[PDB]
Ligand binder design. Structure first.
Ligand SMILES: Nc1ccn([C@H]2C[C@H](O)[C@@H](COP(=O)(O)O)O2)c(=O)n1
Ligand SMILES: Nc1ccn([C@H]2C[C@H](O)[C@@H](COP(=O)(O)O)O2)c(=O)n1
Ligand SMILES: Nc1ccn([C@H]2C[C@H](O)[C@@H](COP(=O)(O)O)O2)c(=O)n1
Ligand SMILES: Nc1ccn([C@H]2C[C@H](O)[C@@H](COP(=O)(O)O)O2)c(=O)n1
Lengths: 246, 246, 246, 246
């Protein structure tokens, strides 16, 4: 059986409770955050707070597909968040396409596919993003990029494929929305590739279980939580917002 | 805030429900298991079903401390479970002492200690057990040992250090009891070392949160689940047991 | 006066000298090239090395005429070189017909025609291919197509119309042959259209001056340079070739 | 290899030959010019004919740094050449600081720096000054300013950075001296910024290659060419000059 987990709605409630109680934690940049530690929930919605920007997600998907570890290869103008985190040559660590499709990271996609193709019940169907050398690699050439995704395991039960996503650190507003788009993409891909290998498999995408060490909102997005707490709306324009989180 | 997780007592209940409903899954050895996928609970007891064998746990601790990748170096008679999984030269992968203390695995314990000593609020305080090359390493020289522990992250909040344990696969009866004893040991050690570096820290051991891709019971231990379901006792002698799981 | 420039024969000689001296530069694909920087010569021959394929050039002319930015609209089977450089929807940037005849690129042909029709001596008769936004456009939707032609200026002196072609990057073997066919076409067109406006003009096509930032040969075509260096023949079948550039 | 180009001394010779032969072309103002079409030379001197006025060049540098498209913002008294070419509100197009540093022109300097910092061997390292809409923009609000510089490309070879400057039109006497001072400034800046990003790069300024569609001298400066032809002096006072170009 799949575990009886929280949903995104209940995560929203706990994040609102945390802000209500001023349970703040100081980020490495010096700014405040609210936070749930050891979060586990079914990702039954594609975002938590904020708006869906399918345009950005598609540019990031194309970058993942290229497997490039240089932020300039992100289609179009590179987001400043990617610029500030990059090395002195424009390099990073956290291209998730490189992580699962590069032979440099030991063919994570292909090996998980072969595993599950040979034994559908396997507990060893897993894609390993992070690496032991990350202790030293995260600030190579002055980058600041310690891999936030650790592992994603895939379990086929009742002809549905469930993903168990293990993250170290996930921003609620931008992080989860982008990362979920990615994990949903890869799950759909895996289902396709297994079904294409044998037409009697008839697998379907199951649940994505999201496990996060520190799931947090930054102070600049507190107004989103505050507004939802008052009104029940998961998004406002920063201009239309009124309340103490200015 | 720390998430509102299940406790061991609730995990027992769900496993008892899975057996009651005959929710069986076939293991790679061909034997049946019951199973919870994407389990997440606070490890608030040192075992789930069965009895505590402090003698064995101490021998396995001594083996971890040696950092030896050979099963003959387990003090005394090497258990058969370790023999059947070892390579042709008696080698394995899953010595957790090697994983956190060897320089070959990039000094996991020391680097996580240095991180947390420099920034107590860090989300980057983590010990990475598994590795990308595990896709190929798990059956080197004919061993069968795919690393079950992925990562353990440590978060200091309110002067308590919480451990978030991410496992791929965990046997409920033997695995959890031994693995919990290990993770408790390391958490206590980390607290001590951080406190020894500065006497004003005054950190204390917090919660151990257990995240398991597949948390399962093998058919040979079904009689334990069944007996608990009927009586509420978490252990019987296999000889004293009466019921249909013989 | 028109400047005393190199000819194609002298370009051949310098390219042979570069290969002789192993003056190699590593392409972005990881492969080797020889190269002349800041090349300037009169294009007094329709190719440098290799053979003329009038069949391909005509298919590319028809695509230019359609002004389509999708590579599938190239008549017949699309060359793989155009496929690998295209976006995820089959789109590119470098349709030169779009560049000079589209109203989206500000009517370059028509405006240059009007300029030269009004003042034959003008220094402002120019067709601008590239654009400032090319810094961001070159990898839109995952294409890899940074416009190689910058500008072509047209100067009418002594009743002859001279073209000054400014390119960023030009492949010696395929690039120059195709691109020259195009630039010769447009020059002949411009002469026709100006003569048709006034029968007393009697303009004639003059010289095409080719200016290239990086004029290069890829390693897979080194055998052409090598063979010419030994024999003086500007083409061999790859099968008939014998020498160290296999 | 860098192409074997003419030097400034040879350009002087060809201009002296053109005047000797009365190879005149009528300017748009109705005045005569001598002219070299498709000129390409290494700028190995900071001027061709005339005298260096470091005072004026510094004022024009300060104007470029402000990025202002209004000629009144040139420090001190705005030169009449800039007044007669400006629009009804004093606006122009050809502030080169605006061209390379404004976000309105798509961040030319920064993007070329990011390209070359990521791949030193790149052929895509370029600053695009002009734009397709210049066909309409050159006489906006009655200005007369059609961008004279098209593109400048930068190529790093043998740890030297070579600039390839592509101009549509360049006055030999005032234009080249001012424009060269500008391009030298930017090349030195780019070297500094690349070296500051990584101390092992150790790049040095290479050659500036000057490519001009129409390189010309106006009739009011013919006395300079004539005097040099006779004596070899690259400058005279107009009062001290004696000869038929009065
Ligand atoms: N795909 C990603 C990459 C990064 N992060 C966020 C999580 C943290 O807010 C920050 C990483 O910081 P740290 O390394 O300090 O956790 O980036 C994320 O949510 N998802
Ligand atoms: N420290 C460990 C090592 C192994 N296992 C158990 C979990 C599975 O029952 C088995 C590994 O099998 P698989 O690799 O098929 O998951 O070993 C465990 O519980 N804890
Ligand atoms: N009409 C074209 C289009 C492209 N290229 C060649 C020049 C380079 O070999 C490559 C472009 O690569 P880069 O953008 O890296 O210069 O394509 C060319 O010669 N002519
Ligand atoms: N930075 C600049 C700007 C302009 N010009 C000169 C070249 C021509 O003499 C004139 C522009 O005229 P046209 O647009 O007719 O070429 O200005 C120049 O030399 N350099």
């Amino acid at each position: 059986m799949i575990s009886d987990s929280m949903t995104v709605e209940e995560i929203r409630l706990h994040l609102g409770l945390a802000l209500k109680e001023k349970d703040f934690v100081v980020d490495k940049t010096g700014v405040k955050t609210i936070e749930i530690i050891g979060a586990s929930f079914v990702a039954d919605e594609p975002f938590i707070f904020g708006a869906l920007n399918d345009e950005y997600i598609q540019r990031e998907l194309e970058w993942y597909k290229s497997k490039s570890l240089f932020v300039k290869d992100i289609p179009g103008e590179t987001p400043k968040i990617w610029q500030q985190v990059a090395s002195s040559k424009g390099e990073i660590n956290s291209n998730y396409g490189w992580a699962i499709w590069s032979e440099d990271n030991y063919a994570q996609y292909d090996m998980c596919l072969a595993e599950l193709g040979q034994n559908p019940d396997s507990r060893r169907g897993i894609m390993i993003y992070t690496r032991p050398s990350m202790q030293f690699d995260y600030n190579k050439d002055g980058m600041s990029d310690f891999m936030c995704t650790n592992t994603v395991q895939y379990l086929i039960r009742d002809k549905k494929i469930n993903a168990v996503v293990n993250m170290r650190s996930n921003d609620v507003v931008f992080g989860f929305r982008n990362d979920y788009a990615w994990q949903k993409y890869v799950l759909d891909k895996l289902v396709s590739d297994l079904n294409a290998g044998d037409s009697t498999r008839q697998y379907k995408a199951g649940s994505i279980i999201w496990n996060v060490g520190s799931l947090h909102v930054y102070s600049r997005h507190f107004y989103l939580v505050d507004h939802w707490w008052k009104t029940g709306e998961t998004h406002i324009s920063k201009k239309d917002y009124v309340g103490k989180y200015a």
